[PDB]
Amino acid sequence: GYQQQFNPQGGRGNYKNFNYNNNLQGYQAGFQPQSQGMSLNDFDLKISESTHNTNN
Amino acid sequence: GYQQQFNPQGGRGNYKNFNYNNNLQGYQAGFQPQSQGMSLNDFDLKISESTHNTNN
Amino acid sequence: GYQQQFNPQGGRGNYKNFNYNNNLQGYQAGFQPQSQGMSLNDFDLKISESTHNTNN
Amino acid sequence: GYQQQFNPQGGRGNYKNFNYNNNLQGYQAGFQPQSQGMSLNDFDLKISESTHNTNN
Amino acid sequence: GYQQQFNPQGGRGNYKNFNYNNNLQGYQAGFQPQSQGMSLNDFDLKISESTHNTNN
């Protein structure tokens, strides 16, 4: 079938923001998982992210 | 079938923002997973990302 | 079948924004995964990205 | 079949924005994955990207 | 079959915006992956890219 398991073998680290969305014959609208920007719904190794959200 | 498992073997690091979307004969509209920009839905190794979102 | 697994072997680093979209005979409209620009849906190694989004 | 696995062997770095889209006999319309520009859907090694999006 | 795997061997760097689109007997319309311009869908080594998108 579908292998989506969380199976780290050995090693070490930081694990966060794992999201599993199972839609079984359903209705899903307006989804922004792990969103960092602005979402409007009307019905030496360095990674650096900086986001400024201003809603007026 | 489909192999999408999380299987790091040895090593070390930072693991974040893993998103699994399974749509089984369903209706999905307006999806911006891991979005950093602006989403409007009307129904030495360095990576640097800077985003300014102004909604007036 | 389809091999899309996450299998780092040894080594080290930063791993983020991995998105798996499985559409099984479904309806998907208006998808901007890992979007950094502006999405409107009406129903020494250095990588630097700077985005300004102004919605009036 | 199809080999699309994530298999770094040794080494080090930054890995982000990996997107796997599997469309199984489905309907997908209006897709802008990893988009940085403007998407309107009506139903010393240096890489530098600067994008200004103004929606009036 | 088709070899499209991500297999860096040794070395180091920055890896981002890898997109795998598998269309299995499906309908895909209006796709602008990794788009930086303007997409309208109606249903010393230096690389520098600057894009201004004005929608009136």
Q: Which residues of C touch B43 (CB under 8 A)?
A: 43
Q: What gap in Å lies between CA D8 and CA C48, rounded to an integer?
A: 23
Q: What gap in Å lies between CA A48 and CA D14, rounded to an integer?
A: 11
Closest alpha carbon within chain D to B52: D52
Q: Which residues of C touch A2 (CB under 8 A)?
A: 22
- Matching residue, tokens 């602008």: E32
Rounded to the nearest angstrom, the gap between the alpha carbon of residue A55 and the centroid of all alpha carbons in its chain is: 22
Of C1, C7, C14, the CB nearest to B13: C14
Q: Which residues of B touch A33 (CB under 8 A)?
A: 19, 33-34
Q: What gap in Å lies between CA C34 and CA A13, rounded to an integer?
A: 23
Q: What gap in Å lies between CA E49 and CA B45, rounded to an integer?
A: 20
The pair of structure tokens assigned to E49 is: 């890219």
Side chain identity at E23, as an amino acid letter? N
Determine whether D46 is exposed, middle or buried from the number of CB atoms within 10 Å of its CB (0-12, 13-18, 19+).
middle
Q: What is the number of residues in chain D?
A: 56
- Between vectors from CA A18 to CA A14 and to CA A24, what angle results, nearest 5°? 165
Name which of A12, B21, E15, E55 is nearest C26 in CA terms.
Answer: B21
Q: What gap in Å lies between CA C20 and CA E15, rounded to an integer?
A: 17
Q: Do D36 and C51 lie within an 8 Å CB cutoff?
A: yes
E53 touches chain B (CB under 8 A): no
Side chain identity at D32, as an amino acid letter? Q
Q: Which strand ranges, in their side-by-side order, compose the sheet holding B2-3?
A: A2-3, B2-3, C2-3, D2-3, E2-3
A45 touches chain D (CB under 8 A): yes
Q: Which residues contact B36 (CB under 8 A, 6 or more apart)?
A: A35, A36, A37, A49, A51, B49, B51, C34, C35, C36, C51
Of C2, C37, C47, the CB nearest to E14: C47
D13 Rama sector, left if φ>0, alpha if ψ -120 to 50, beta otherwise: left
Beta carbons within 10 angstroms of residue E53's beta carbon: 20
